[PDB]
Amino acid sequence: VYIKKVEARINEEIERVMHCLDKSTEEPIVKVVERELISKHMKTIVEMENSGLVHMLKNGKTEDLGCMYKLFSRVPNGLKTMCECMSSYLREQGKALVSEEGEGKNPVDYIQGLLDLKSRFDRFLLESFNNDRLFKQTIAGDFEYFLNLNSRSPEYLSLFIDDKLKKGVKGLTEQEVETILDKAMVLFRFMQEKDVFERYYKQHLARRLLTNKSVSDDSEKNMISKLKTECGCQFTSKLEGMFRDMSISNTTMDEFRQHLQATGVSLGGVDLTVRVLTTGYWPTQSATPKCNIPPAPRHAFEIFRRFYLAKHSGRQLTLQHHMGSADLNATTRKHILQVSTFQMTILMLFNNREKYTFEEIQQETDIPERELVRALQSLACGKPTQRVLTKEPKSKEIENGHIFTVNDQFTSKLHRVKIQTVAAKQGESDPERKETRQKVDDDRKHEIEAAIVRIMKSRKKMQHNVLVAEVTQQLKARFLPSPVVIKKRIEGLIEREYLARTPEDRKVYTYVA
Amino acid sequence: CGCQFTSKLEGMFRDMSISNTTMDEFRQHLQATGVSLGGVDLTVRVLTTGYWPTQSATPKCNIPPAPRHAFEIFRRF
Amino acid sequence: KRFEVKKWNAVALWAWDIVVDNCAICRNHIMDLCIECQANQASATSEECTVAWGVCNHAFHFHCISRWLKTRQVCPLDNREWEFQKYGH
Ligand SMILES: [Zn+2]
Ligand SMILES: [Zn+2]
Ligand SMILES: [Zn+2]
């Protein structure tokens, strides 16, 4: 209530001075009144206690913020401390929100809460601060400061955008989707470490394009357009390139169907939804888990590979199992199951002969280690009341001598029932996090070398630390400079030609190829 | 008449065209699938609800076994 | 039978002319150093020499393809312009 009282006092003082005194009579009077009231109440009334500035902002009092902004704008150095206190509150809220101590947090919920806080602050700014530049600059700096603190925030942002892009169940119409995408990209604007963000976005693209299609079919253009007005023309190009790879893949599916129909409709490859991708675009470098392919799929894959190897001369079709899906027609009704190319071999072995165990599915199949355990656990352990592979030794841990059986489980009300044990709650275990961190570290280590060999060929030479500032400025918007890493890496090229950058002869550098 | 209902007439003619394309493609895919012998000489047709007045498309009745298998194969495809 | 597979949705990977047995630039191998590295340890500090992958799915040593960027860079195994799409085998 003090602000309203002081505003009324100022209004009555100015009315009296303009009506009861001379014509101008206001400059020294208003200046001294401001210097006495605001310059003395500014330090203590906004920070001490009992609904100052922080509390009146936490509860969401729009009128209080508006009147404080309209009052403190007259006196210099008022907006400075106002924004300082606002930034302190923002830092406190972020630290309370970006807290890492404690496992079991939902990344999508975390990103949603961060976006809600950003939207709340933007609404407060628009309603009270009248879009002041200083407040926007302070909040942008605060976001850059507390968001870059965590290096796992880009991953959570990517998970949130994947959750929003997989299906528009929430917000069926397009206006709210557009607003939420704009808010998400605004939040990403005040974020560093774009390399991990791009890597995880590409991984999410691979996950969503190599699974059931028809997710949005239109929002991909919006996503790439936003990524060209935010990231630019760098890896968004490779994203659209792997989309074109999907296009080429579907052209191949239809042409191979036509060719099979002409050479006797393939019975083994009745519905061969085979796909063709390139190694460079999609992160399929681990595409060699040699394991027995079921008789009919084996022949189908051989026919498809023969058709493809000829079609485009030199198409070495490597075999892999860690991608794709299938529809297993089971059979009182005929309900069709679903296997994501992980349970096909075990189920085929069961069809050949039932009453198998771990030794049987580990001896005569040439199976890997980790994926075997994952698939076995998905098929047996942690299953709701729709089990398709039961066992007698009911236990959590996996034994060796356990017999496998099958249950009817008529709870499925349709003919197309799928077991979606994969893509569970986001755990982000230590091994996968470590391997992706190593991958992104190598990516940065090669990117810095590519930049230094692309830029310094047409620039001047450095003596001690001249060109490193330029190479860090060029990568300021990408990630941290990492001075020790770049310093250790720039001295590794001296072993051979093409700008060896001799340390002893640093006076001049070889401007040759 | 002009261009009021003639366009929809040629549209249902195109629906017939789409239907015959579906007949030949399903015949080709029949040899590929052919779960049983129910899918023999099949002359199935595909039309749209808007063009043809087939709004009364819900007689829920049993089907003979060979037609049952043929319909199941067509639905799966 | 009790379970019969109806649909299969596999994904096929392919490469143009990587020649695992030999770098098309250096003719040593896809791995195991290059012509300008020779000794594996020497002074390498974890052997920065890696395998470079382009948009044309052709694979050479990163050192092998870095020496060709100075002059014409047309991925001499085809007409496509060489890019850098993947590092490490
Ligand atoms: Zn080589
Ligand atoms: Zn080398
Ligand atoms: Zn090439």
PDB file of all heavy atoms in Angstrom, chain B residues 11-41, unseen atoms left out:
ATOM      1  N   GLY B  11     -16.280 -38.079 -60.613  1.00  0.00           N
ATOM      2  CA  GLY B  11     -15.567 -38.508 -59.427  1.00  0.00           C
ATOM      3  C   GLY B  11     -15.896 -39.927 -59.013  1.00  0.00           C
ATOM      4  O   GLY B  11     -15.000 -40.693 -58.656  1.00  0.00           O
ATOM      5  N   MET B  12     -17.174 -40.304 -59.055  1.00  0.00           N
ATOM      6  CA  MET B  12     -17.508 -41.699 -58.777  1.00  0.00           C
ATOM      7  C   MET B  12     -17.086 -42.617 -59.920  1.00  0.00           C
ATOM      8  O   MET B  12     -16.795 -43.796 -59.684  1.00  0.00           O
ATOM      9  CB  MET B  12     -18.999 -41.869 -58.470  1.00  0.00           C
ATOM     10  CG  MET B  12     -19.950 -41.133 -59.387  1.00  0.00           C
ATOM     11  SD  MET B  12     -21.612 -41.835 -59.373  1.00  0.00           S
ATOM     12  CE  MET B  12     -21.325 -43.404 -60.187  1.00  0.00           C
ATOM     13  N   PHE B  13     -17.011 -42.103 -61.150  1.00  0.00           N
ATOM     14  CA  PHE B  13     -16.373 -42.877 -62.211  1.00  0.00           C
ATOM     15  C   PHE B  13     -14.896 -43.131 -61.904  1.00  0.00           C
ATOM     16  O   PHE B  13     -14.398 -44.252 -62.090  1.00  0.00           O
ATOM     17  CB  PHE B  13     -16.525 -42.152 -63.549  1.00  0.00           C
ATOM     18  CG  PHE B  13     -16.704 -43.074 -64.722  1.00  0.00           C
ATOM     19  CD1 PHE B  13     -17.720 -44.016 -64.727  1.00  0.00           C
ATOM     20  CD2 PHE B  13     -15.865 -42.994 -65.820  1.00  0.00           C
ATOM     21  CE1 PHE B  13     -17.893 -44.863 -65.804  1.00  0.00           C
ATOM     22  CE2 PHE B  13     -16.033 -43.840 -66.900  1.00  0.00           C
ATOM     23  CZ  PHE B  13     -17.048 -44.776 -66.892  1.00  0.00           C
ATOM     24  N   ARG B  14     -14.189 -42.108 -61.419  1.00  0.00           N
ATOM     25  CA  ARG B  14     -12.817 -42.297 -60.959  1.00  0.00           C
ATOM     26  C   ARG B  14     -12.756 -43.253 -59.774  1.00  0.00           C
ATOM     27  O   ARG B  14     -11.763 -43.966 -59.605  1.00  0.00           O
ATOM     28  CB  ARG B  14     -12.197 -40.953 -60.579  1.00  0.00           C
ATOM     29  CG  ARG B  14     -11.919 -40.030 -61.753  1.00  0.00           C
ATOM     30  CD  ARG B  14     -11.728 -38.598 -61.277  1.00  0.00           C
ATOM     31  NE  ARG B  14     -12.741 -37.693 -61.807  1.00  0.00           N
ATOM     32  CZ  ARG B  14     -13.093 -36.549 -61.236  1.00  0.00           C
ATOM     33  NH1 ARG B  14     -12.537 -36.140 -60.107  1.00  0.00           N
ATOM     34  NH2 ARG B  14     -14.025 -35.798 -61.812  1.00  0.00           N
ATOM     35  N   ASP B  15     -13.794 -43.261 -58.939  1.00  0.00           N
ATOM     36  CA  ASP B  15     -13.881 -44.238 -57.859  1.00  0.00           C
ATOM     37  C   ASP B  15     -13.950 -45.652 -58.418  1.00  0.00           C
ATOM     38  O   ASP B  15     -13.325 -46.572 -57.886  1.00  0.00           O
ATOM     39  CB  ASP B  15     -15.099 -43.953 -56.980  1.00  0.00           C
ATOM     40  CG  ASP B  15     -14.818 -42.925 -55.907  1.00  0.00           C
ATOM     41  OD1 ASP B  15     -13.750 -42.280 -55.960  1.00  0.00           O
ATOM     42  OD2 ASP B  15     -15.666 -42.772 -55.004  1.00  0.00           O
ATOM     43  N   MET B  16     -14.715 -45.843 -59.494  1.00  0.00           N
ATOM     44  CA  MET B  16     -14.740 -47.139 -60.168  1.00  0.00           C
ATOM     45  C   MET B  16     -13.359 -47.497 -60.709  1.00  0.00           C
ATOM     46  O   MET B  16     -12.934 -48.660 -60.653  1.00  0.00           O
ATOM     47  CB  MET B  16     -15.789 -47.125 -61.287  1.00  0.00           C
ATOM     48  CG  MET B  16     -15.650 -48.213 -62.361  1.00  0.00           C
ATOM     49  SD  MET B  16     -14.414 -47.929 -63.651  1.00  0.00           S
ATOM     50  CE  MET B  16     -15.049 -46.441 -64.415  1.00  0.00           C
ATOM     51  N   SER B  17     -12.654 -46.509 -61.255  1.00  0.00           N
ATOM     52  CA  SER B  17     -11.296 -46.726 -61.751  1.00  0.00           C
ATOM     53  C   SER B  17     -10.366 -47.190 -60.632  1.00  0.00           C
ATOM     54  O   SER B  17      -9.604 -48.155 -60.790  1.00  0.00           O
ATOM     55  CB  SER B  17     -10.754 -45.450 -62.398  1.00  0.00           C
ATOM     56  OG  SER B  17     -11.738 -44.833 -63.209  1.00  0.00           O
ATOM     57  N   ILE B  18     -10.434 -46.507 -59.491  1.00  0.00           N
ATOM     58  CA  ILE B  18      -9.644 -46.845 -58.313  1.00  0.00           C
ATOM     59  C   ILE B  18     -10.022 -48.249 -57.865  1.00  0.00           C
ATOM     60  O   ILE B  18      -9.165 -49.036 -57.446  1.00  0.00           O
ATOM     61  CB  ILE B  18      -9.855 -45.821 -57.183  1.00  0.00           C
ATOM     62  CG1 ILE B  18      -9.310 -44.451 -57.594  1.00  0.00           C
ATOM     63  CG2 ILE B  18      -9.196 -46.290 -55.894  1.00  0.00           C
ATOM     64  CD1 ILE B  18      -7.837 -44.459 -57.939  1.00  0.00           C
ATOM     65  N   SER B  19     -11.313 -48.576 -57.966  1.00  0.00           N
ATOM     66  CA  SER B  19     -11.778 -49.896 -57.568  1.00  0.00           C
ATOM     67  C   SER B  19     -11.137 -50.980 -58.419  1.00  0.00           C
ATOM     68  O   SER B  19     -10.663 -51.989 -57.890  1.00  0.00           O
ATOM     69  CB  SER B  19     -13.302 -49.972 -57.658  1.00  0.00           C
ATOM     70  OG  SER B  19     -13.733 -49.989 -59.008  1.00  0.00           O
ATOM     71  N   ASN B  20     -11.100 -50.788 -59.743  1.00  0.00           N
ATOM     72  CA  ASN B  20     -10.512 -51.829 -60.589  1.00  0.00           C
ATOM     73  C   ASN B  20      -9.003 -51.928 -60.392  1.00  0.00           C
ATOM     74  O   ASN B  20      -8.436 -53.034 -60.445  1.00  0.00           O
ATOM     75  CB  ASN B  20     -10.861 -51.622 -62.069  1.00  0.00           C
ATOM     76  CG  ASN B  20     -10.292 -50.344 -62.647  1.00  0.00           C
ATOM     77  OD1 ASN B  20      -9.079 -50.138 -62.675  1.00  0.00           O
ATOM     78  ND2 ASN B  20     -11.172 -49.501 -63.168  1.00  0.00           N
ATOM     79  N   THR B  21      -8.336 -50.793 -60.154  1.00  0.00           N
ATOM     80  CA  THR B  21      -6.923 -50.852 -59.781  1.00  0.00           C
ATOM     81  C   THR B  21      -6.740 -51.680 -58.515  1.00  0.00           C
ATOM     82  O   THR B  21      -5.807 -52.489 -58.410  1.00  0.00           O
ATOM     83  CB  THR B  21      -6.358 -49.444 -59.590  1.00  0.00           C
ATOM     84  OG1 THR B  21      -7.103 -48.759 -58.577  1.00  0.00           O
ATOM     85  CG2 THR B  21      -6.425 -48.658 -60.891  1.00  0.00           C
ATOM     86  N   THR B  22      -7.643 -51.504 -57.548  1.00  0.00           N
ATOM     87  CA  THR B  22      -7.589 -52.301 -56.329  1.00  0.00           C
ATOM     88  C   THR B  22      -7.829 -53.780 -56.608  1.00  0.00           C
ATOM     89  O   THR B  22      -7.179 -54.630 -55.996  1.00  0.00           O
ATOM     90  CB  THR B  22      -8.601 -51.786 -55.309  1.00  0.00           C
ATOM     91  OG1 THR B  22      -8.565 -50.355 -55.276  1.00  0.00           O
ATOM     92  CG2 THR B  22      -8.264 -52.323 -53.927  1.00  0.00           C
ATOM     93  N   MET B  23      -8.759 -54.109 -57.512  1.00  0.00           N
ATOM     94  CA  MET B  23      -8.987 -55.515 -57.842  1.00  0.00           C
ATOM     95  C   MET B  23      -7.720 -56.155 -58.389  1.00  0.00           C
ATOM     96  O   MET B  23      -7.319 -57.239 -57.944  1.00  0.00           O
ATOM     97  CB  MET B  23     -10.127 -55.684 -58.854  1.00  0.00           C
ATOM     98  CG  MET B  23     -11.222 -54.663 -58.784  1.00  0.00           C
ATOM     99  SD  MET B  23     -12.377 -54.717 -60.163  1.00  0.00           S
ATOM    100  CE  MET B  23     -13.549 -55.915 -59.562  1.00  0.00           C
ATOM    101  N   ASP B  24      -7.070 -55.500 -59.355  1.00  0.00           N
ATOM    102  CA  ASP B  24      -5.877 -56.121 -59.927  1.00  0.00           C
ATOM    103  C   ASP B  24      -4.735 -56.195 -58.916  1.00  0.00           C
ATOM    104  O   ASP B  24      -4.036 -57.217 -58.849  1.00  0.00           O
ATOM    105  CB  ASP B  24      -5.434 -55.402 -61.207  1.00  0.00           C
ATOM    106  CG  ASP B  24      -5.091 -53.944 -60.986  1.00  0.00           C
ATOM    107  OD1 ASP B  24      -4.110 -53.655 -60.268  1.00  0.00           O
ATOM    108  OD2 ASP B  24      -5.785 -53.088 -61.567  1.00  0.00           O
ATOM    109  N   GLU B  25      -4.539 -55.147 -58.107  1.00  0.00           N
ATOM    110  CA  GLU B  25      -3.456 -55.188 -57.126  1.00  0.00           C
ATOM    111  C   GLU B  25      -3.712 -56.252 -56.062  1.00  0.00           C
ATOM    112  O   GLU B  25      -2.783 -56.944 -55.629  1.00  0.00           O
ATOM    113  CB  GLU B  25      -3.253 -53.808 -56.495  1.00  0.00           C
ATOM    114  N   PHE B  26      -4.970 -56.415 -55.638  1.00  0.00           N
ATOM    115  CA  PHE B  26      -5.288 -57.442 -54.654  1.00  0.00           C
ATOM    116  C   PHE B  26      -5.158 -58.837 -55.242  1.00  0.00           C
ATOM    117  O   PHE B  26      -4.757 -59.764 -54.536  1.00  0.00           O
ATOM    118  CB  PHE B  26      -6.696 -57.227 -54.098  1.00  0.00           C
ATOM    119  N   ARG B  27      -5.498 -59.010 -56.521  1.00  0.00           N
ATOM    120  CA  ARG B  27      -5.256 -60.295 -57.168  1.00  0.00           C
ATOM    121  C   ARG B  27      -3.768 -60.616 -57.188  1.00  0.00           C
ATOM    122  O   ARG B  27      -3.361 -61.750 -56.901  1.00  0.00           O
ATOM    123  CB  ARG B  27      -5.825 -60.287 -58.587  1.00  0.00           C
ATOM    124  N   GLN B  28      -2.936 -59.620 -57.512  1.00  0.00           N
ATOM    125  CA  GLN B  28      -1.491 -59.831 -57.503  1.00  0.00           C
ATOM    126  C   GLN B  28      -0.994 -60.202 -56.109  1.00  0.00           C
ATOM    127  O   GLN B  28      -0.190 -61.129 -55.948  1.00  0.00           O
ATOM    128  CB  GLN B  28      -0.776 -58.578 -58.012  1.00  0.00           C
ATOM    129  N   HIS B  29      -1.509 -59.505 -55.090  1.00  0.00           N
ATOM    130  CA  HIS B  29      -1.059 -59.749 -53.690  1.00  0.00           C
ATOM    131  C   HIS B  29      -1.693 -61.027 -53.125  1.00  0.00           C
ATOM    132  O   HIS B  29      -1.230 -61.490 -52.067  1.00  0.00           O
ATOM    133  CB  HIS B  29      -1.364 -58.527 -52.811  1.00  0.00           C
ATOM    134  N   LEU B  30      -2.715 -61.567 -53.797  1.00  0.00           N
ATOM    135  CA  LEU B  30      -3.416 -62.776 -53.282  1.00  0.00           C
ATOM    136  C   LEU B  30      -2.443 -63.959 -53.296  1.00  0.00           C
ATOM    137  O   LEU B  30      -2.376 -64.676 -52.281  1.00  0.00           O
ATOM    138  CB  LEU B  30      -4.646 -63.064 -54.148  1.00  0.00           C
ATOM    139  N   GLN B  31      -1.714 -64.141 -54.401  1.00  0.00           N
ATOM    140  CA  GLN B  31      -0.735 -65.255 -54.508  1.00  0.00           C
ATOM    141  C   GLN B  31       0.350 -65.081 -53.439  1.00  0.00           C
ATOM    142  O   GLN B  31       0.817 -66.106 -52.904  1.00  0.00           O
ATOM    143  CB  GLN B  31      -0.134 -65.301 -55.913  1.00  0.00           C
ATOM    144  N   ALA B  32       0.729 -63.833 -53.142  1.00  0.00           N
ATOM    145  CA  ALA B  32       1.761 -63.563 -52.113  1.00  0.00           C
ATOM    146  C   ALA B  32       1.246 -64.019 -50.746  1.00  0.00           C
ATOM    147  O   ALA B  32       1.966 -64.775 -50.067  1.00  0.00           O
ATOM    148  CB  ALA B  32       2.113 -62.096 -52.112  1.00  0.00           C
ATOM    149  N   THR B  33       0.045 -63.575 -50.363  1.00  0.00           N
ATOM    150  CA  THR B  33      -0.548 -63.972 -49.059  1.00  0.00           C
ATOM    151  C   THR B  33      -1.100 -65.397 -49.169  1.00  0.00           C
ATOM    152  O   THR B  33      -0.334 -66.345 -48.902  1.00  0.00           O
ATOM    153  CB  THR B  33      -1.636 -62.982 -48.623  1.00  0.00           C
ATOM    154  N   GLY B  34      -2.376 -65.536 -49.542  1.00  0.00           N
ATOM    155  CA  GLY B  34      -2.988 -66.869 -49.706  1.00  0.00           C
ATOM    156  C   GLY B  34      -2.808 -67.731 -48.470  1.00  0.00           C
ATOM    157  O   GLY B  34      -2.292 -68.857 -48.610  1.00  0.00           O
ATOM    158  N   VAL B  35      -3.218 -67.224 -47.302  1.00  0.00           N
ATOM    159  CA  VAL B  35      -3.118 -68.006 -46.032  1.00  0.00           C
ATOM    160  C   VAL B  35      -3.815 -69.353 -46.241  1.00  0.00           C
ATOM    161  O   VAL B  35      -3.197 -70.391 -45.930  1.00  0.00           O
ATOM    162  CB  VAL B  35      -3.727 -67.234 -44.847  1.00  0.00           C
ATOM    163  N   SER B  36      -5.051 -69.334 -46.748  1.00  0.00           N
ATOM    164  CA  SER B  36      -5.784 -70.595 -47.040  1.00  0.00           C
ATOM    165  C   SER B  36      -6.204 -70.607 -48.514  1.00  0.00           C
ATOM    166  O   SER B  36      -5.620 -69.834 -49.299  1.00  0.00           O
ATOM    167  CB  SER B  36      -6.972 -70.752 -46.129  1.00  0.00           C
ATOM    168  N   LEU B  37      -7.181 -71.447 -48.868  1.00  0.00           N
ATOM    169  CA  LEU B  37      -7.679 -71.506 -50.268  1.00  0.00           C
ATOM    170  C   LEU B  37      -8.938 -70.641 -50.385  1.00  0.00           C
ATOM    171  O   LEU B  37      -9.553 -70.638 -51.470  1.00  0.00           O
ATOM    172  CB  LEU B  37      -7.973 -72.964 -50.635  1.00  0.00           C
ATOM    173  CG  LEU B  37      -7.015 -73.590 -51.647  1.00  0.00           C
ATOM    174  CD1 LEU B  37      -6.610 -72.578 -52.708  1.00  0.00           C
ATOM    175  CD2 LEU B  37      -5.786 -74.156 -50.953  1.00  0.00           C
ATOM    176  N   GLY B  38      -9.298 -69.933 -49.309  1.00  0.00           N
ATOM    177  CA  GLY B  38     -10.485 -69.057 -49.329  1.00  0.00           C
ATOM    178  C   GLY B  38     -10.332 -67.928 -50.332  1.00  0.00           C
ATOM    179  O   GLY B  38     -11.346 -67.552 -50.951  1.00  0.00           O
ATOM    180  N   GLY B  39      -9.112 -67.405 -50.489  1.00  0.00           N
ATOM    181  CA  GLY B  39      -8.857 -66.341 -51.480  1.00  0.00           C
ATOM    182  C   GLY B  39      -8.654 -66.916 -52.871  1.00  0.00           C
ATOM    183  O   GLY B  39      -7.492 -66.976 -53.318  1.00  0.00           O
ATOM    184  N   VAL B  40      -9.741 -67.326 -53.533  1.00  0.00           N
ATOM    185  CA  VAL B  40      -9.653 -67.895 -54.912  1.00  0.00           C
ATOM    186  C   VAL B  40      -9.919 -66.774 -55.922  1.00  0.00           C
ATOM    187  O   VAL B  40      -9.190 -65.764 -55.887  1.00  0.00           O
ATOM    188  CB  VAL B  40     -10.633 -69.069 -55.105  1.00  0.00           C
ATOM    189  CG1 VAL B  40      -9.914 -70.408 -55.106  1.00  0.00           C
ATOM    190  CG2 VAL B  40     -11.745 -69.056 -54.066  1.00  0.00           C
ATOM    191  N   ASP B  41     -10.922 -66.951 -56.787  1.00  0.00           N
ATOM    192  CA  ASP B  41     -11.283 -65.896 -57.772  1.00  0.00           C
ATOM    193  C   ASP B  41     -11.926 -64.727 -57.021  1.00  0.00           C
ATOM    194  O   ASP B  41     -13.132 -64.812 -56.724  1.00  0.00           O
ATOM    195  CB  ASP B  41     -12.172 -66.445 -58.888  1.00  0.00           C
ATOM    196  CG  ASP B  41     -11.615 -67.689 -59.557  1.00  0.00           C
ATOM    197  OD1 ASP B  41     -11.583 -68.746 -58.897  1.00  0.00           O
ATOM    198  OD2 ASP B  41     -11.224 -67.592 -60.737  1.00  0.00           O
TER     199      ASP B  41
END
